Amino acid sequence: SKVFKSTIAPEEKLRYIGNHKQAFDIEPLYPLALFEEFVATTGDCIIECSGKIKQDQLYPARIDLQFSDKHHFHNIHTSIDFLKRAASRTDVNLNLDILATFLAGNFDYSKVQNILAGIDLRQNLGESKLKLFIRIGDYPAKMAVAKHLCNITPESEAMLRSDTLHIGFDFYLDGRSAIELYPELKKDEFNHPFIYNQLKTILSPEALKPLPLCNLFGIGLSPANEANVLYYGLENIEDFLSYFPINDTARRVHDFYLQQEGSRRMTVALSESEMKAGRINNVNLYYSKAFTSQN
């Protein structure tokens, strides 16, 4: 049968996804089945399960898979095959024109640093979307293309690093598409006094409070965002409730993953307006689990 022998069975990955589907009553939404059999074909990877909370509404059909090897061409190729297979449904149309623009030419795949393929499915077909993430490093030509696709004003350009660029693609099943850039700072970097003091100019002290808890901090820039999204990579999931006063709907998601085996780290995404409110009512929560072979 197989040729490559891992210690990770494909059932382990689908069980982690299945635990998410059971906890939050995720019934089959297109193309969840196609995404799961795509997950079963992957090698070493990290799977992120997520919940998007808007007031008392919960959207939990959010899963991302990060490839944990350096085969960038193959992993991009297989992710796009999933995008093309999902687009085979007659009443679905994916607009890949912005991804085609980014990948056009003699694309140097040796500049790719990280790849994620994901979903965010709703009961509304047109409101569901598929996702592709690509991080590139020291690639001026394609960083320029990505910046132009994002239509970043010179103010947002000052947020972007020149050594790395984290790019996300959204593909709604009704033809809508968007690009997003995620400039980030590591703990050693936003602890630099010459960087943290400038953060005091652009961000409120409420948005700066959880920084001692984080190994990563970033912002999402996209024409599709109502406002810039703040991203916090927490080092310890147990520190979350002391600094992020989420509502009960988001609390059900976080309480479930306080007891799920996997990474101790987590990610929270929310607007700066939510950080200044007394209670977080609109937020994304991300939790992950690693699947790596011991051979």
163 binds, among Mg ion, its own copies, none (CB under 5 to 8 A by kind): none
Minimum distance from residue 116 beta carbon to Mg ion (Å) = 12
The reply to whether 180 sits in an annotated binding site is yes
Minimum distance from residue 9 beta carbon to Mg ion (Å) = 32
Minimum distance from residue 32 beta carbon to its own copies (Å) = 8
Closer by beta carbon to its own copies, 31 or else 210: 31
Residue that the structure tokens 């920084």 belong to:
211
Angle among Cα 268, 14, 11 to the nearest 5 degrees reads: 140
Distance CA 127, CA 172 (A): 6
Beta bridge partners of 119: 63, 130
| Binding footprint of its own copies on the chain (CB under 8 A) | 22, 25, 27-30, 32-33, 89-91, 123-125
188 binds, among its own copies, Mg ion, none (CB under 5 to 8 A by kind): none
Q: What is 119-178 written as a DSSP string? A: EE--SSTTT-EEEEEEEEES-HHHHHHHHHHHT--HHHHTTS-SSEEEEEEEEETBS-EE
Closer by beta carbon to Mg ion, 43 or else 126: 126
Stretches 9-17, 24-32, 152-160, 176-184: which one binds Mg ion (CB under 5 A)? 176-184
Beta bridge partners of 278: none
Stretches 101-109, 182-190, 219-227, 243-251: which one binds Mg ion (CB under 5 A)? 219-227
Which residues contact residue 29 at a Cβ distance below 8 angstroms, ignoring those fewer than 6 apart?
Answer: 61, 121, 122, 123, 128
User: Binding site for Mg(2+): residue ranges?
Assistant: 180
Binding site for Mg ion (CB under 5 A): 180, 220
